[PDB]
Amino acid sequence: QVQLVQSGGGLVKPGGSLTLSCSASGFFFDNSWMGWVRQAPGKGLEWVGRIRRLKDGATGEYGAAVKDRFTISRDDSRNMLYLHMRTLKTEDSGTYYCTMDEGTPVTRFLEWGYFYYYMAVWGRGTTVIVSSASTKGPSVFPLAPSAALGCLVKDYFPEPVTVSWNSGALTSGVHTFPAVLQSSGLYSLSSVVTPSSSLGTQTYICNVNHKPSNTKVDKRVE
Amino acid sequence: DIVMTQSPSSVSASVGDRVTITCRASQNIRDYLNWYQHKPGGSPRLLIYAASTLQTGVPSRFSGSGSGNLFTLTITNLQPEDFATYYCQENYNTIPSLSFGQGTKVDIRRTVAAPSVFIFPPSDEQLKSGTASVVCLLNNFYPREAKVQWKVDNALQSGNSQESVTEQDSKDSTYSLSSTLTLSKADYEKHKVYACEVTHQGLSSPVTKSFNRG
Amino acid sequence: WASLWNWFDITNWLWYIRKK
Ligand SMILES: [Ca+2]
Numbered sequence: 001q002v003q004l005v006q007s008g009g010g011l012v013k014p015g016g017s018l019t020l021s022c023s024a025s026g027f028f029f030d031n032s033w034m035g036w037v038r039q040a041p042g043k044g045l046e047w048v049g050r051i052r053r054l055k056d057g058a059t060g061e062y063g064a065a066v067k068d069r070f071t072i073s074r075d076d077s078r079n080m081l082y083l084h085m086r087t088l089k090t091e092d093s094g095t096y097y098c099t100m101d102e103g104t105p106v107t108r109f110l111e112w113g114y115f116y117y118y119m120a121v122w123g124r125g126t127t128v129i130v131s132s133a134s135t136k137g138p139s140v141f142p143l144a145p146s147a148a149l150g151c152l153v154k155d156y157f158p159e160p161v162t163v164s165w166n167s168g169a170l171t172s173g174v175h176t177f178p179a180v181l182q183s184s185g186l187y188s189l190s191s192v193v194t195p196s197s198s199l200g201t202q203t204y205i206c207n208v209n210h211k212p213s214n215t216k217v218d219k220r221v222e
Numbered sequence: 223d224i225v226m227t228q229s230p231s232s233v234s235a236s237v238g239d240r241v242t243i244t245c246r247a248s249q250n251i252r253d254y255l256n257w258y259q260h261k262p263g264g265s266p267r268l269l270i271y272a273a274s275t276l277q278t279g280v281p282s283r284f285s286g287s288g289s290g291n292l293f294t295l296t297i298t299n300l301q302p303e304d305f306a307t308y309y310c311q312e313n314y315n316t317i318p319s320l321s322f323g324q325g326t327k328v329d330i331r332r333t334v335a336a337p338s339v340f341i342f343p344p345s346d347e348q349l350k351s352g353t354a355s356v357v358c359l360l361n362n363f364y365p366r367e368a369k370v371q372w373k374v375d376n377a378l379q380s381g382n383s384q385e386s387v388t389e390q391d392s393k394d395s396t397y398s399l400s401s402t403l404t405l406s407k408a409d410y411e412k413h414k415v416y417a418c419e420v421t422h423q424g425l426s427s428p429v430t431k432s433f434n435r436g
Numbered sequence: 437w438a439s440l441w442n443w444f445d446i447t448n449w450l451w452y453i454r455k456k
Binding site: 044045047050063097104116117118119120121123124139142143144150154175178180189190194 | 258322342348
């Protein structure tokens with residue numbers, strides 16, 4: 001069974017550098033072509049680059065958006081694949097997957113020398129965020145009726161945020177929306193839950209945890 | 223140099239249905255095409271290379287066809303695990319571009335369900351911060367298509383709201399949406415009536431939820 | 437590296453045969 005585990009990456013301001021790493025196990029790393037694929041948040045897949053075996057020249061080939069800025073390298077003794085990112089831009093944010101590429105020779109005589117090329121095994125992905133924002137905890141604001149209750153977790157960075165209701169005792173009918181990046185560079189989301197007779201009978205509190213700033217807020221909605 | 227355009231960008235279906243995604247190339251690429259399956263929160267999975275060759279381990283429910291510049295992925299007897307986003311990819315240029323299509327997400331089909339709309343005024347705590355956010359909640363609706371318009375004193379707002387939507391519910395297969403209008407305190411305290419107008423297939427006419435500041 | 441055989445070694449061999 002093939003196992004790819006990725007590390008590195010994280011948060012960095014634009015114009016800075018950042019190295020991703022992909023550790024291979026379960027196959028012959030040295031005899032395999034490798035590469036990377038990324039997916040900006042809300043966008044689709046986009047090939048980043050590949051690298052050949054050492055005997056093939058260890059040639060690094062890159063997509064247009066990242067050529068001249070990203071470089072791939074491999075370590076056959078450590079079975080490691082690296083993606084060196086420098087002069088980063090906000091548009092480089094997203095989830096980078098390292099891939100185990102392989103090919104199949106084309107048999108049509110006129111195309112002898114060409115191959116099908118594909119990513120046969122993909123890693124779990126590593127998140128890259130290119131932003132100038134500093135670490136900040138959220139401001140939890142209540143969402144009161146006039147039923148629908150909710151909490152507004154506003155102005156935090158980076159992701160993620162955890163939200164529960166009544167310390168996890170209340171889960172039926174909950175909707176915690178994905179975060180949205182605001183024009184300020186900070187993230188925002190809301191958690192909501194849907195009887196009108198429970199007002200007064202039951203108090204409602206949302207438990208907002210933000211580990212990046214080590215913040216815990218229990219906010220009552222009434 | 224090669225552009226791939228998939229269609230449809232979204233498609234709904236029930237289990238046991240035949241799904242047909244088409245992928246089109248800006249030029250002739252023979253059979254140098256791959257298909258990938260990507261479920262949310264998961265690693266992409268290779269389905270087909272060479273346009274029609276099934277990868278080892280993939281169910282035979284997936285078949286790839288086509289050649290040149292028009293390719294099709296067909297999923298017969300659709301299954302629960304098959305609800306995901308699929309991409310096509312070209313691998314034709316000797317100088318690799320390896321361009322993907324924008325993707326195609328397959329959703330679960332269910333009867334039309336109208337959204338329950340709620341509007342929320344800014345909390346008094348937030349107003350102290352010099353900022354005000356108004357929320358319009360659309361709960362348990364299907365399909366995902368929906369329109370939300372903010373009106374402050376009947377003035378149609380544009381460019382000051384952010385929408386967010388959950389993934390198709392696992393119990394009722396519905397969606398939930400939140401639209402957050404953001405204004406400064408002055409622009410908020412300067413006006414009185416705030417409304418969000420929701421338009422959805424399941425609604426006979428657009429529904430309006432408004433409040434009076436105070 | 438003499439013991440490394442993969443798809444790419446085929447295609448380079450078929451290419452050489454075709455172009456010579
Ligand atoms: Ca090795």
